[PDB]
């Protein structure tokens, strides 16, 4: 019917609500459920899909094997209905990589994947299911794009994309799009100091993107984009609360405007917050280390505020069970007089921190705001490794 | 499209003919079908569908193992084309939780599950396929639901819920809904002393449910409600004729406005009953014991005299296999002048029963009305579990 | 969309082309291809669809073992896209029960099946996918009907029934629906000693019927139907080609008013033929004792005259293969200006011919007519028993 | 929604963008694959399709044993969405048979399956999923056709087929079809000696169709086709550099009015080449006596020049891998001002290459055109053959 529009403040939210579990792995164990990894959702106004990067094969084909493997010739992005596992038999093949992005700008699905050798990869770039744009790499180094939905506004759709090193300074941009066609091309600006795999949402005309800084911050880089201009700002979450993976401990105050450094072993994981005010909330992994558990943490003023705690929390994954990437989207098309933050959490199984077996893959859960005070549990994977072995 | 008005009058019945039958547990042999429990039907404009709360396995898969237990985090509504089995590749997830109700009001359908942990449970509604309305725990003890379908009239669709203890007194209400919003809250009035599991239907603008008391009597309560002034009354079954499950033999009286006590070993099952004078029908397991036989029994004034017996009988299922739940729908939108009965037996296959095998599971049959005079046999569900083992 | 007038003639038929094969015995040795039998095909505006009773099991499923018996409360009409094999996943149920027909009046679609004990049986008649009527067994006896589509003409689709005994007297009648419901019934009239299994098309307003004398005759009964009356007669075909199965050697004259007795060990099969003058094909088992080989033969006359013999033939099925039941349909809709004659032939594998194994199924291939002269194959079923060893 | 007509150019083309793989082979070692080969992919208004021919069977089942065999009354044409493996569940059947083509027309789609015995063969020529016209063998000896799609303009579709020997003079027509009515039949004209499995595209009004010589060439012929005329010419590609394979070295000129003979020790491929001038791009494998390996090479003027080669090169299957047939596809209802070039090549796994495994199946793998500078890697299959050991 039209163009979507991003006029709608965002709701309140005081507690998470369970939108959608697919329980990928424990069916996967019997049916014919894809290996993935990457997963998020993203709607449209007739409904939610989950996409993914699939790997080629089943979860007990013999061709798991090896699927720890971030980038190869088989992967691409994939989408299906809400709540089911990725099967061979009900999903669509959005476009082909091993790096992705997908929005729908109200009228028609833009869907943008890169593929090719390190030193030479390219995105193409779809809209309405067919390809309208290719992009070769700027600077020789993994070409690559947020791994969560993108978001848009009068037609207009920001896309953030890095090339280069991943432990050291690279090249990002900001490409609007309009039908899948390129409208205009910005490097990126600001005290961000390394750009990855952006968690971005959009409200009252503007969009912010919540970012991983790979290189040193374990604070979160956020861009802010003005879709109509077409222009953009870049810096840190203020909070002393730290929130990528491999962290240090949380300092008494935090960075606006540089990297808080330090944490072992990691350099980093895709994660998201909703920065509202009052009304702001940042996920991230309960353990500082690894890639375990997943809280929800409501802090007040986290995107101004160096000194902003935690004043209520919300266990989603139990730290002992295993957690993943997490990204943020909205149902832009409710009926609903404000848009409401939703989530999702990947729940990897498998390599490197399971070992008895020779894949990796992940299943999804999703979440969405309540204004009420909601129960809770842990709404882990539920799969058992030694069905597996 | 226009909103379901309640404005005819049911169908005179005689016996009961053939609907639908999934076998879902032969065809889960082979084939990959996904293991369910507490099953049902809805209709909408369109047709009719059926609906269950999925294990989040298949039933052959090794996670099958363990599926006696009744609420975890894999456990969502599934839904899907009436007579398939349940496969991963062919239902639709309408909510994420362990206990739940569904149906259309005329121009979309209501869905609404309960999920996390018995001291604090919440529900979730949902309307149109989108997550509307979230209703936290009242009394800190499984919130839950009827696990048949609702029933709605002028937009206004009626649910009942209990909250509170399995064994002793508990805090039912009935929750008025319209467009996913709460319309009215009521606590429950009048002689049912506990109320689970309501199976309801509508005719001449009112709406009955006929419930579980897993307290005390092996008569049913009966809850009658007006969808239009939004109140309701309640009592018991009054007929001798006993329909729940461990009940002991039929006493010369029944009791309108009091429980029947009696029967061992289990306090109750969900089941049903058609009321309208003349033209009632009772439902109930053939073992007085256990879940296993269904015999359907017209008992003419049952809800109204203690002294009715009935006048004829149709075996659903034989007493030498097993039954479960059941429970009520209609297809309001038939090309009838009157709304005819329709019902289905859940056919539990498994523990604790056949503990043979390690998990538990259920398929489907399903009959509805007729004026004449059909013959009948039994509806089995016809699996060989010795091939499991 | 408007109701379906037999307004057209027969198209001349010179040759037969393949218009579908499902191979589903090969497909099924591994993927989950659902046991079937009583096969056929059936058209409406949008395309064709194949139809078949499901035994509720797969193929290779362990509940595949004793499917040679032919009723049971596990079986249902499926109907699914022509040209796929039927598994769980691409099928729709159309009613349940172990003896059906089936048609398109232009606006929708009615399916009729019988269900329950040997002497209890009932139909139950579906339109647009709702139950509409249900029919009580009259004779206490298998209350079946045609196995292949029915017709209809200006929204009349007469259907021919059968009640009683296989090897004796029994009672048919003519029942006329309209949307489903009972226009009129009429009892078997004329000179046709018994009927079973009617195969049936409609042209230049008129509807003819070729069926199975279980009997006595190896000479197939023929009932001419007039749809706008509500009328019909019976006779035997006239040719002294004979074409039931389990025949004695072709006589050197037919008899139009008369069983011809005699073969061993058969009392019949389904069976079909067009009746058009000098454009007249009758299809017959190549074997004269058992189900192998399939035949198609340019009889002129044969409707007529029983000195009538064969002028042309080709080899649909060769006689090293299985074969089974065959049947009538055409496709209305086609855009052509006469009525072109199709035909199936059901490919029995496993029980009784092939007791290697411990089920019975098929697959099917249809074929429809050519004004060319074209080449033929055998169209076998091309599974290896082996295999399933 | 109109007749397509081919007035665009074609778009200028730099390098390849991938478009689409399936990754059959890997997915099919578990999951439930048909075993295919002779694939293409073919486009309407609303997106793109693959095509094949099904052996009916799945890979991993036992019938997959034999599958090099080339002809069966088990084969079928079945196209099923873009990216996804072709299984039972997901795939239409076109027609039966073992040699096919396929073309939208911008109203329907015309699809042709060739099927008989060798000396017997006919054609069933469909249109909108309905059978139209039939064509018998004029030579005798297995009647075949393109493999890839057809191509139209204004609703006049031309098709090429051969009837005769493959090592030898033969029958070659070109059949101009209008709703899958034949408009007019032409004898192959020109200096082409030998022609089978065009590949073809439409640009500026023309239709050039690039084949396979399999009697005496390892340079590939020509066929010029005006669809308004419905009248051809015929020639050989001018270029030294040479595409068929089991070809010799390239000579110093090429030859554009008769075959250059050599190469050992097959005698031809089925391949693609675009033809435009400058614009001019050729397919070949790698090797020169095997199919394995597959590059673009662009060669300005091969149509004209005898002395033309490449100014640039894109590898597309490194030369350790298998490839196998390739044609030529373009979305003619893109939105843009001129036609953009796709192809795509089947990735032939198993026998003869591979022979400890008993069958022979396939992968697809597309690319399309790109004004860019892109860069690329090897589109590989991706499956281990010990896995199906
Ligand atoms: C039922 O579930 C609800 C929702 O999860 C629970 O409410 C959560 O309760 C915890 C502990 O009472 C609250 O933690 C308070 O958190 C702040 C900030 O972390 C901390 O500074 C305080 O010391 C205190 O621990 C948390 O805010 C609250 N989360 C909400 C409401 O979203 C409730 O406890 C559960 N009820 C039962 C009976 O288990
Ligand atoms: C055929 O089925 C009908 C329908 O169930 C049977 O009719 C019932 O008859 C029994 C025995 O007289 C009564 O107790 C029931 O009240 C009747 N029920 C209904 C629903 O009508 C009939 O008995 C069966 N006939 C045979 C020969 O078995
Ligand atoms: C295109 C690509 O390789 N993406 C990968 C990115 C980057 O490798 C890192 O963020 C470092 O840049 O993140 C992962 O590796 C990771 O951390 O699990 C997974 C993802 O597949
Ligand atoms: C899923 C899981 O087991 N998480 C556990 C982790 C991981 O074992 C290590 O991070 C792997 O190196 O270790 C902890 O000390 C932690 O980090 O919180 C405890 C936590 O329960
Ligand atoms: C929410 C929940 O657990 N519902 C369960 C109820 C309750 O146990 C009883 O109604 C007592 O409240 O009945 C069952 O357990 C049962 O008897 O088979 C099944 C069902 O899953
Ligand atoms: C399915 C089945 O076998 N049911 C039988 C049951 C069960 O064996 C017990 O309920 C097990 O506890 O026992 C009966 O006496 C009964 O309950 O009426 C007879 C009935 O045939
Ligand atoms: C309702 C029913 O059982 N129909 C069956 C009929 C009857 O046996 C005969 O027509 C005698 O009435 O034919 C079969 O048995 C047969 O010959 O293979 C198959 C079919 O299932
Ligand atoms: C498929 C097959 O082998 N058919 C053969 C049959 C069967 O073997 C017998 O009917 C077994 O009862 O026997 C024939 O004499 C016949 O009936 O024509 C020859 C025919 O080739
Ligand atoms: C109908 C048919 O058999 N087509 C086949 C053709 C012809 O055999 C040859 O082109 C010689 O005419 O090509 C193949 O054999 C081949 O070379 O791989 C495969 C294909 O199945
Ligand atoms: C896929 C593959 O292994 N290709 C190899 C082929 C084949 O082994 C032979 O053609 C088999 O006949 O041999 C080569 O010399 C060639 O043809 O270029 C090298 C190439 O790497
Ligand atoms: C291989 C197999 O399962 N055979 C079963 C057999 O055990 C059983 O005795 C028979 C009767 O039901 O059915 C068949
Ligand atoms: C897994 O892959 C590795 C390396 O590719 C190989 O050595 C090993 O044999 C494979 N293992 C299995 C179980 O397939
Ligand atoms: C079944 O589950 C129990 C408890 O988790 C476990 O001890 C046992 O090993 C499992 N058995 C099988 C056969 O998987
Ligand atoms: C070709 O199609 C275009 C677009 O619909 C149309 O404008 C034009 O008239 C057509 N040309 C011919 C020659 O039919
Ligand atoms: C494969 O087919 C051949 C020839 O039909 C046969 O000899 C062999 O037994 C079959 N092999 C297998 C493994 O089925
Ligand atoms: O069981 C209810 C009724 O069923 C019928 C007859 O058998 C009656 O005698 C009986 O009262
Ligand atoms: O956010 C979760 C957090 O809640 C509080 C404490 O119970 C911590 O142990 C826990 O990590
Ligand atoms: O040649 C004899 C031949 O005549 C004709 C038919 O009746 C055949 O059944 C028979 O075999
Ligand atoms: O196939 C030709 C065939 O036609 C018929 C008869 O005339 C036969 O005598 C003759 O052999
Ligand atoms: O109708 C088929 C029939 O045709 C004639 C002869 O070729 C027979 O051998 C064959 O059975
Ligand atoms: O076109 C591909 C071609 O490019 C040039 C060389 O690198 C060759 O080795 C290669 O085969
Ligand atoms: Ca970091
Ligand atoms: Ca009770
Ligand atoms: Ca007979
Ligand atoms: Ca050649």
């Given at each position: 019917r039209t163009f979507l529009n991003l006029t709608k403040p965002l709701c309140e939210?005081?507690?998470?609500?369970?939108?959608?579990?697919?329980?990928?792995?424990?069916?996967?164990?019997?049916?014919?459920?894809?290996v993935t990894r990457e997963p998020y959702l993203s709607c449209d106004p007739q409904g939610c899909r989950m996409f993914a990067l699939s790997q080629?094969?089943?979860?007990?084909?013999?061709?798991?094997?090896?699927?720890?493997?971030?980038?190869?010739?088989?992967?691409a992005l994939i989408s299906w209905e809400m709540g089911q596992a990725p099967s061979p038999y009900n999903?669509?093949?959005?476009?082909?990589?091993?790096?992705?992005?997908?929005?729908?700008?109200?009228?028609?699905?833009?869907?943008?994947?890169?593929?090719g050798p390190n030193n030479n990869a390219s995105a193409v770039?779809?809209?309405?299911?067919?390809?309208?744009?290719?992009?070769?790499?700027?600077?020789?180094?993994?070409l690559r794009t947020q791994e969560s939905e993108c978001v848009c506004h009068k037609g207009v759709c920001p896309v953030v994309m890095?090339?280069?090193?991943?432990?050291?300074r690279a090249a990002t941009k900001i490409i609007y799009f309009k039908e899948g066609k390129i409208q205009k091309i910005?490097?990126?600006?600001?005290?961000?100091?390394?750009?990855?795999?952006?968690?971005?949402?959009?409200?009252?005309?503007?969009?912010?993107?919540?970012?991983?800084?790979?290189?040193?911050?374990?604070?979160?880089?956020?861009?802010?984009?003005d879709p109509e201009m077409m222009t953009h700002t870049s810096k840190y979450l203020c909070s002393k609360v730290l929130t990528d993976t491999s962290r240090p401990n949380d300092p008494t105050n935090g960075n606006c405007?540089?990297?808080?450094?330090?944490?072992?072993?990691?350099?980093?994981?895709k994660g998201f917050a909703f920065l509202d005010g009052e009304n702001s909330w940042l996920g991230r992994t309960i353990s500082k280390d690894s890639r375990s558990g997943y809280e929800m943490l409501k802090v007040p003023n986290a995107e101004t505020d160096i000194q902003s705690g935690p004043i209520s929390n919300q266990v989603i994954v139990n730290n002992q069970n295993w957690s993943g990437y997490s990204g943020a989207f909205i149902d832009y098309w409710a009926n609903k007089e404000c848009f409401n933050p939703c989530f999702?959490?990947?729940?990897?199984?498998?390599?490197?921190?399971?070992?008895?077996?020779?894949?990796?893959?992940?299943?999804?859960?999703?979440?969405?705001?309540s204004k009420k005070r909601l129960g809770s549990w842990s709404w882990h994977d539920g799969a058992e490794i030694i069905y597996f072995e």
């Amino acid at each position: 019917r039209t163009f979507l529009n991003l006029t709608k403040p965002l709701c309140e939210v005081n507690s998470w609500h369970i939108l959608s579990k697919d329980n990928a792995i424990r069916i996967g164990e019997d049916a014919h459920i894809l290996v993935t990894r990457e997963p998020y959702l993203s709607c449209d106004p007739q409904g939610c899909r989950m996409f993914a990067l699939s790997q080629g094969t089943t979860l007990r084909g013999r061709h798991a094997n090896g699927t720890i493997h971030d980038r190869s010739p088989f992967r691409a992005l994939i989408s299906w209905e809400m709540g089911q596992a990725p099967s061979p038999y009900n999903t669509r093949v959005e476009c082909i990589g091993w790096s992705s992005t997908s929005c729908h700008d109200g009228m028609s699905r833009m869907s943008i994947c890169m593929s090719g050798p390190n030193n030479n990869a390219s995105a193409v770039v779809w809209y309405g299911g067919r390809p309208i744009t290719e992009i070769p790499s700027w600077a020789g180094n993994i070409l690559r794009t947020q791994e969560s939905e993108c978001v848009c506004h009068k037609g207009v759709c920001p896309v953030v994309m890095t090339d280069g090193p991943a432990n050291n300074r690279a090249a990002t941009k900001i490409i609007y799009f309009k039908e899948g066609k390129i409208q205009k091309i910005e490097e990126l600006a600001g005290n961000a100091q390394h750009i990855e795999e952006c968690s971005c949402y959009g409200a009252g005309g503007v969009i912010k993107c919540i970012c991983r800084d790979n290189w040193k911050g374990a604070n979160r880089p956020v861009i802010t984009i003005d879709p109509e201009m077409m222009t953009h700002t870049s810096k840190y979450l203020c909070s002393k609360v730290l929130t990528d993976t491999s962290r240090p401990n949380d300092p008494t105050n935090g960075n606006c405007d540089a990297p808080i450094t330090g944490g072992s072993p990691d350099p980093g994981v895709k994660g998201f917050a909703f920065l509202d005010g009052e009304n702001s909330w940042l996920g991230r992994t309960i353990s500082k280390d690894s890639r375990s558990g997943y809280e929800m943490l409501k802090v007040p003023n986290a995107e101004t505020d160096i000194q902003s705690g935690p004043i209520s929390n919300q266990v989603i994954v139990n730290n002992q069970n295993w957690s993943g990437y997490s990204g943020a989207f909205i149902d832009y098309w409710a009926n609903k007089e404000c848009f409401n933050p939703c989530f999702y959490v990947e729940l990897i199984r498998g390599r490197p921190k399971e070992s008895s077996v020779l894949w990796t893959s992940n299943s999804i859960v999703a979440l969405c705001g309540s204004k009420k005070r909601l129960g809770s549990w842990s709404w882990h994977d539920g799969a058992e490794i030694i069905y597996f072995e």
